[PDB]
Design a protein around this ligand. Structure first.
Ligand SMILES: CN(C)c1cccc(NS(=O)(=O)c2nnc(NC(=O)c3ccc4ccccc4c3)s2)c1
Ligand SMILES: Cc1cc2nc3c(=O)[nH]c(=O)nc-3n(C[C@H](O)[C@H](O)[C@H](O)COP(=O)(O)O)c2cc1C
Ligand code: SF4
Length: 363
């Protein structure tokens, strides 16, 4: 209960601790995880990606081959609404974010869906989101946070937003190459010291000075309070952490509670992705199936990302990311796809969100 970490202001919202749990798709950070995180005084973040899979397609209008048909069902408005409602049964009106990737054409529809579902903050990476305020003008209080890989992106985002909307972002998350999910770096750049998060945070904070010290949130490879203090001492206003929350009981993808305590470092690797950025995966499930020559059949049903072009890139890289992550949420160990931050192998015990926040904030 006693902490020397100070509350963090994001636009019109305040969180007791300068900690986000990063959004995790598919079905990894929904109502149980995000709700309990926000209950603890950190920012809980609901993933808006693949919400059609929620409760095995409870809220989809059409299913083909056990998959949500097209993007209107893959990004399901009614599912998102119920995930927020269920989260607020736990955290009340404590702030919640919605994470939505940029590399869908339907971006504005899902952003307004998140706003209408009750999100207080929108977080967007997997691209350069120069038009977030376009879709949010009906919701003046929702804070808007791009995820960036570099100071150059910060400067462009601020100029494009300022010129077009007379608004700048409420915060920036800078994500480094030790992160889970996709990486904002070329494969070869992920191993180079110049792009280590400790090197990126100073540059982004310095870039932020010119626009009035927009808060910078450091993400990627942050494990414990010592890493938090390191990032804060480098100018960051807070941290976003995901892999630690991936290893909590309240994670909405229950498979991880069985998979992570066995996870070995040599079984974590960067792979290709239909999204067009390197993804950090666990060497199991669909990956192993591909290497055996038993790859699941590919045929675009959910139309989940624009860069894929309805299966072109999925066929080239060998797997459909929607199908694989959805199968993991539904419990499929043989054909599911599984993601992790570089630190995933350090998960031994599965602990509660409450004990994890205690660990991260005590003192
Ligand atoms: C700022 N830029 C260019 C950039 C690039 C890469 C990473 C980052 N950093 S990041 O936005 O924090 C992210 N890390 N992982 C991400 N994964 C996803 O979006 C994702 C997860 C599951 C899906 C399932 C189905 C369809 C789409 C899916 C998309 S996004 C920034
Ligand atoms: C399993 C998993 C799934 C993720 N999926 C997403 C996602 O859908 N959208 C996103 O913006 N970030 C995603 N991320 C990135 C996290 O939100 C976060 O920025 C990053 O993992 C922080 O690094 P850490 O895991 O070392 O704390 C994912 C991370 C993990 C581990
Ligand atoms: S085939 Fe490509 S666009 Fe279609 S659902 Fe799979 S990854 Fe998404």
């Amino acid at each position: 209960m006693v902490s020397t970490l100070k509350p963090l202001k994001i636009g019109k919202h305040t969180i007791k601790f300068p900690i986000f749990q990063g959004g995790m798709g598919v079905g990894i950070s929904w109502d149980e995880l995000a709700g309990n995180v926000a209950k603890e005084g950190a920012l809980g973040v609901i993933s808006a990606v693949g919400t059609g899979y929620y409760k095995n397609m409870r809220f989809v209008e059409r299913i083909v081959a056990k998959k949500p048909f097209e993007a209107l069902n893959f990004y399901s408005k009614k599912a998102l609404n119920e995930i927020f409602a269920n989260a607020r049964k736990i955290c009340g009106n404590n702030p919640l974010g919605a994470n939505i990737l940029y590399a869908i054409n339907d971006y504005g529809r899902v952003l307004r869906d998140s706003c209408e579902a009750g999100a207080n903050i929108i977080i967007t990476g997997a691209g350069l989101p120069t038009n977030m305020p376009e879709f949010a003008k009906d919701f003046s209080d929702v804070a808007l946070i791009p995820i960036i890989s570099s100071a150059k992106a910060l400067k462009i985002l601020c100029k494009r937003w300022s010129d077009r909307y007379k608004r700048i972002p409420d915060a920036f998350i800078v994500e480094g190459p030790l992160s889970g999910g996709h990486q904002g770096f070329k494969y070869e750049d992920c191993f180079k010291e110049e792009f280590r998060l400790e090197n990126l945070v100073p540059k982004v904070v310095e870039a932020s000075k010119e626009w009035g010290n927009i808060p910078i949130i450091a993400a990627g490879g942050i494990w414990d309070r010592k890493d938090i203090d390191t990032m804060l001492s480098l100018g960051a206003s807070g941290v976003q952490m995901a892999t630690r929350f991936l290893g909590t009981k309240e994670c909405d993808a229950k498979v991880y509670a069985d998979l992570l305590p066995t996870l070995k470092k040599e079984d974590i690797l960067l792979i290709k992705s239909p999204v067009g950025y390197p993804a950090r995966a666990i060497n199991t499930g669909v990956i192993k199936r591909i290497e055996e020559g038993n790859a699941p059949k590919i045929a675009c049903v959910s139309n989940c990302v624009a860069p894929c072009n309805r299966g072109e890139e999925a066929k080239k890289v060998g797997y459909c990311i929607a199908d694989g992550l959805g199968r993991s949420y539904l419990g499929n160990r043989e054909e599911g796809l599984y993601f992790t931050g570089a630190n995933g192998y350090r998960v031994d015990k599965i602990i509660s969100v409450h004990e994890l926040i205690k660990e991260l904030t005590e003192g």
